[PDB]
Amino acid sequence: MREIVHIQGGQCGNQIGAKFWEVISDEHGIDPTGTYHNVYYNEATGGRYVPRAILMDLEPGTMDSVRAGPFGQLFRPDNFVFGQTGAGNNWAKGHYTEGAELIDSVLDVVRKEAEGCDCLQGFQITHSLGGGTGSGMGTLLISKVREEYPDRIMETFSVVPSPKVSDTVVEPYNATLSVHQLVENADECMVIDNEALYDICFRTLKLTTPTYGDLNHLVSAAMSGVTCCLRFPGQLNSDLRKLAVNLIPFPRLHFFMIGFAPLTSRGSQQYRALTVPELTQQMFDAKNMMCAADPRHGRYLTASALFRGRMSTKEVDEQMLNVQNKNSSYFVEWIPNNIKSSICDIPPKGLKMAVTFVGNSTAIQEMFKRVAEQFTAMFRRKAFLHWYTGEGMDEMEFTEAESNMNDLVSEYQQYQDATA
Amino acid sequence: MREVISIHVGQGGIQVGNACWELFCLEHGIQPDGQMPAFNTFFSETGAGKHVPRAVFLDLEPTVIDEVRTGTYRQLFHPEQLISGKEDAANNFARGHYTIGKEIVDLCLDRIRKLADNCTGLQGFLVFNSVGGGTGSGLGSLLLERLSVDYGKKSKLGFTIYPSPQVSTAVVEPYNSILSTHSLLEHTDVAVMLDNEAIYDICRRNLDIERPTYTNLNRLIAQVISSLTASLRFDGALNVDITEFQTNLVPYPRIHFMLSSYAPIISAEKAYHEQLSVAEITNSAFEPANMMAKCDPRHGKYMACSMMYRGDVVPKDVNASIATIKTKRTIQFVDWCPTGFKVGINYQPPTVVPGGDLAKVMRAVCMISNSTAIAEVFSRLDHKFDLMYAKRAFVHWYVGEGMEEGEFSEAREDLAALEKDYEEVGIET
Amino acid sequence: MREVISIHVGQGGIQVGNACWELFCLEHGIQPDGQMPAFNTFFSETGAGKHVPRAVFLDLEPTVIDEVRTGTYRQLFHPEQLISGKEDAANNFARGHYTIGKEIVDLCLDRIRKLADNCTGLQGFLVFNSVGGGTGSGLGSLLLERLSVDYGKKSKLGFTIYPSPQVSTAVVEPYNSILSTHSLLEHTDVAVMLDNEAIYDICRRNLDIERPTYTNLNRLIAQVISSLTASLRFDGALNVDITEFQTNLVPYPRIHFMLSSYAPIISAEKAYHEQLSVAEITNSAFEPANMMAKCDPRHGKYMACSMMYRGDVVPKDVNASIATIKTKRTIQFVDWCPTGFKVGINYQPPTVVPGGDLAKVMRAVCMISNSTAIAEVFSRLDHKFDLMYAKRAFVHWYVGEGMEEGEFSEAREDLAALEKDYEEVGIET
Amino acid sequence: QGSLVSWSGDIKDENYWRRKFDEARHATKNKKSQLLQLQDKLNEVSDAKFGAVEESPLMRQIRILENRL
Amino acid sequence: ELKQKIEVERRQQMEIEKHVVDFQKKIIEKRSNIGGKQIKILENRLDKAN
Ligand SMILES: Nc1nc2c(ncn2[C@@H]2O[C@H](COP(=O)(O)OP(=O)(O)OP(=O)(O)O)[C@@H](O)[C@H]2O)c(=O)[nH]1
Ligand SMILES: Nc1nc2c(ncn2[C@@H]2O[C@H](COP(=O)(O)OP(=O)(O)OP(=O)(O)O)[C@@H](O)[C@H]2O)c(=O)[nH]1
Ligand SMILES: Nc1nc2c(ncn2[C@@H]2O[C@H](COP(=O)(O)OP(=O)(O)O)[C@@H](O)[C@H]2O)c(=O)[nH]1
Ligand SMILES: [Mg+2]
Ligand SMILES: [Mg+2]
């Protein structure tokens, strides 16, 4: 049981959710038709399994496109929360004028899906920080669900403004506005960025003609591997809360980087062996992360690992022992045995093993600082402001968002080196 | 007459109990059907002439629970002895002892209530709680509390699995373990400790299998426990008493944390080539490499030792092995206990499981000892606890669940009181 | 009662021991299975009524080791008595005694530790180390050192194979041999030397086979050793004592390097045509062409001689052969030893191996003698050592492995002290 | 311009860090073996090793019983 | 820029590692130094005279 509800947001979040449901259907043996050929699905007369997946957005072209592609019959025709105007890359648009009139349609449907279960252990949001809709609308949904349900655990698979270029000109504004309302009411922010995702699909995988469905498939395989330890048996099982405890020692430093494995070349997929020491090499390799922040330029406040496949436990023991042994000061030493380990008992579709590494570390603080830097630049010199200020927002909130980001990062950095 | 109850609370204890019962049936001759083609201590009567165990598998996370209820061993357990929660304790002590413990405690108490009503001659309890997780820490602590406030007079032998010396399957292990030690003191009348490193070394370089796994580990623990309970199950030459165990291995109610050992652990490939004499096995008996836990034999001065002989054992080889071990200087005892040896002979050889690495041999011995070395495990747990408590880590996970902050420290110096006494009792005069 | 331990260290000793045990089983009636369809000295008890030898095959290079562990004789040896290294000693003494020796020495000491614990009545050791290679030199030296510092009281008979007089399978033989001689003095209480030229001549023009090979050589050494250990294995007429061997063949602890000989070595093709009388065999006994090592019988003045008679031997032919050899001038003894003869009769004829060139005959005799001729082998080794040491050759191979340079010289004049004493003891008065 | 100079300096910093880790772990493992061997030394050195065979109580038994005989 | 901290750390750890190498040497020398039952049989010797 121990339910999940899959609310989406923005065209990004919509595509990622579509492909994630594709992956979970293809894993649980669910067709695009919705049969078997409940921890994620719901029973429906006629022998159907409907995903309790809500797609909300301020534009329907995304809605139409996600309906059009394969696996579209999964989502039932009520959870398509239709927006007609579009926030148009404006946090004020996506959070105040259209938020405060979409909140409650979403409230009725989320109460729908929440009473549909018995025990809703955790939520599920995938959205953006830069798009007006995604950012504002999504952090507003987060605030609302965290207002009524204080006992659940919040979780966002969040895409941030890209380093080399900003996807939309107001990426800094929307991103700081999203994090300022993310810190207190979002319990686990898995930080992803389109550029690092590009890097991981490019470097070791031969992919020369990539596509957004491809990156969605990658991050959705990761998104399935993070929790696949829940719905399946295992010698040493976990959940969202053992993970949350072993990951956050403080309610603030709870933003996590994620990676999934294995991922190698296909033409070279035969020449290499395939073992668990090789899995450790694969992801404790710096380049295998899904965030534009090499974690070995910082420190690991703690890190959790979740296995998939049936091998021994001698493995995971020597695993985190060996890795702590050499990359010790790459972690933080003020906390004992900062690596947590669990095992899911089932391997992936067609392959032998899977591994998911999640990390509560202090290298995303530079991501936060680069966001705040771009923000402050466009902010003092007043770049792209009337779009936010002529729609019932003031820059007092912008100042406080920027300063709050800076406060978060100041704790991140001092907790990097705090020792006793 | 003698009946013994076993709780398998947590995810560690529940798998240890799965292996315990999977070995108990094959030893007593019970097939997994509940059908059998003495057993007084473990197996009850159902009015149709077949057996249902007197044990309860309790755990917050229901995964291993449906594993056992739809596996192959469904026909043994009673549906009344398998209760599941829909959540966990998040590896913190407060969620398993304060929040989610209270609605499972009364159900478990009613089940064991009626189960102690069911059997006539209860003699002892066995709590199986790997303290590393929130359930095996807090819910097991609360279970032991209630067991001791209801029953009290009856002995309790806890096979608690501490957070391992440096390896760990969780980071917040140091908190939810020191807090369980408090209840572990009073309630667990005698506590046979477990850790992971030593059984890993044993399974790797003793049975020559190159990946040791948890199923093998739990099978091996079940074999040790079979050597433990054979004396009451089957008839022996000089039968020992489990209440004699307490009166001989608890010199003071302050020193009752005890460790164990087993011989022989050998593959068939070296069993065919070894002699394995009665005197020879008594050497690997106190071998420090054979040690089952993270304790050093020369760290502790032995205060009490019980030897469990099973198979074709003649008493005089036992008596001469005692002489040779007491002669050679490599072992020593506490001065106040001039004779701290108690032996028990049993004419039942160890039974064999199909599909096990373990080898059938004539003679088996199991050591269980109250010494003063365990204080090192105590201080080593205190290491991680202080290293985490000095910096505020995971404190919110504990206080946001009905727990005050001072319990961390009170449990820390509680286990420090054990460390103090364990070195104050074992000195010269 | 009497048990004897054999180390076969190096690549020479390990093959000599392969042949030793392959002959021992066929003699005692043991098949290579470990099954037999007395043996007290060599064969132990496994509790299933079958035998595992009391010996260890040690070598840095693991090639011959996996040869024996996947050959046809796997069922005999215990997996505890076969330890392998992953490297060599590069034929230099320092890599086998200083660098790679230290992590194998304690394992071998623990194995023989427990093995001397296993057998009850140990009586002697036999070290089998062809010193030509780095292992058989340095690791064998260190093994003998540890054997003598742990055991001490017990006799050690070393069948060391020196670098051959002029032939050589290695060039750096002169260094790593003189350095082993140091430890060979104190530790190897009695040292029966071996070289290659004489057994080559024997196998070529004595058994008439035209290519002698190492398997035949090791089989022949095993036959000599069978004639040696028959007295303790099987019952004889006048049984001899291996501690009498020392007290009669070690007139001074400075002269204990001894040589050997065997008769008859004859093919069946001349055994059918020869009479081979008891008196006749005693002539080829001291024949200088029959000599087993590079020693000249008229070079040394015999100080002690032990004769090993086996088969159908009546004592008076023995006594009259002693008379005739002491009468004729071609032999002579030291003046201080007026009677330096000790004989041992045995009613067990030599057993036959299928597939051997060796012929079955009624009477066999084995000579083992402490004389003063061995000093020529000593000086001949010193030849090559000085010729190499005078020019700096391979010095780096030794000093880059934790060795100082002066040990070369200290070992050179160490063996020179033997050469000195061996001529100072055997003069007139 | 200076950004690539900083890049190269940070490659040097990465190498330097990596090194410091190698040598720190070597130091740890060496110290652990050294402590192991030193404790082996302190327990192997007996507290009655100077008198390798003394047993003074039974030496007194020896002398008094010799006088007796 | 900020590298001298890790350089002095390397110097410290290298002095300490070679210093524990000296330690190890000292301990192996002391092991080689230390490298350099009859009571009951004497009671048996007493039995005969009594
Ligand atoms: N010996 C042994 N130990 C086990 C076994 N299974 C789990 N463990 C140990 O149990 C520890 C965790 O204890 P648990 O209380 O069972 O963890 P949990 O069930 O997830 O508890 P929660 O965190 O509240 O969900 C791990 O660190 C393991 O070392 C087993 O089968 N045999
Ligand atoms: N009699 C006899 N001598 C042998 C036999 N095998 C090897 N030898 C001798 O052993 C000498 C070399 O000694 P070893 O110590 O075994 O050489 P090694 O094993 O290669 O030693 P490393 O150089 O350290 O690798 C050779 O010169 C041979 O004369 C054998 O089967 N019988
Ligand atoms: N991973 C992923 N990211 C996307 C995809 N489509 C858009 N994005 C990212 O999402 C951001 C757009 O945010 P969004 O809220 O959807 O825009 P809005 O709907 O106009 O407010 C851009 O910065 C893109 O980089 C996709 O298919 N996959
Ligand atoms: Mg649990
Ligand atoms: Mg070699």
mmCIF file of N, CA and C in Angstrom, chain C residues 207 264 266-269 271 352 356-361:
data_model
loop_
_atom_site.group_PDB
_atom_site.id
_atom_site.type_symbol
_atom_site.label_atom_id
_atom_site.label_comp_id
_atom_site.label_asym_id
_atom_site.label_seq_id
_atom_site.Cartn_x
_atom_site.Cartn_y
_atom_site.Cartn_z
ATOM 1 N N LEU C 207 70.621 -47.832 -14.510
ATOM 2 C CA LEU C 207 69.346 -48.392 -14.941
ATOM 3 C C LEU C 207 69.230 -48.479 -16.452
ATOM 4 N N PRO C 264 70.691 -52.502 -4.282
ATOM 5 C CA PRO C 264 71.200 -52.419 -5.645
ATOM 6 C C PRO C 264 70.309 -51.547 -6.520
ATOM 7 N N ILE C 266 69.665 -51.710 -10.223
ATOM 8 C CA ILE C 266 69.869 -52.601 -11.350
ATOM 9 C C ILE C 266 68.539 -52.757 -12.065
ATOM 10 N N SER C 267 68.605 -52.874 -13.382
ATOM 11 C CA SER C 267 67.406 -53.173 -14.138
ATOM 12 C C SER C 267 67.024 -54.633 -13.926
ATOM 13 N N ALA C 268 65.796 -54.981 -14.312
ATOM 14 C CA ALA C 268 65.409 -56.386 -14.272
ATOM 15 C C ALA C 268 66.233 -57.194 -15.266
ATOM 16 N N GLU C 269 66.644 -56.552 -16.359
ATOM 17 C CA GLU C 269 67.394 -57.223 -17.414
ATOM 18 C C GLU C 269 68.772 -57.684 -16.943
ATOM 19 N N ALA C 271 69.106 -57.978 -13.380
ATOM 20 C CA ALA C 271 68.749 -58.643 -12.131
ATOM 21 C C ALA C 271 68.470 -60.120 -12.367
ATOM 22 N N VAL C 352 57.601 -52.302 -4.613
ATOM 23 C CA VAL C 352 57.765 -51.994 -6.030
ATOM 24 C C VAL C 352 56.658 -51.042 -6.461
ATOM 25 N N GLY C 356 58.041 -48.238 -12.858
ATOM 26 C CA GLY C 356 59.369 -47.802 -12.452
ATOM 27 C C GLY C 356 60.439 -48.632 -13.124
ATOM 28 N N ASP C 357 61.593 -48.004 -13.370
ATOM 29 C CA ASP C 357 62.730 -48.730 -13.926
ATOM 30 C C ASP C 357 63.337 -49.666 -12.888
ATOM 31 N N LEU C 358 63.021 -49.436 -11.616
ATOM 32 C CA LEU C 358 63.677 -50.141 -10.520
ATOM 33 C C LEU C 358 63.253 -51.601 -10.469
ATOM 34 N N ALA C 359 64.184 -52.468 -10.076
ATOM 35 C CA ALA C 359 63.966 -53.908 -10.073
ATOM 36 C C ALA C 359 63.748 -54.418 -8.653
ATOM 37 N N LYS C 360 62.864 -55.407 -8.512
ATOM 38 C CA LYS C 360 62.663 -56.054 -7.221
ATOM 39 C C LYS C 360 63.732 -57.110 -6.979
ATOM 40 N N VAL C 361 64.403 -56.998 -5.837
ATOM 41 C CA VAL C 361 65.455 -57.922 -5.438
ATOM 42 C C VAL C 361 65.263 -58.281 -3.970
#
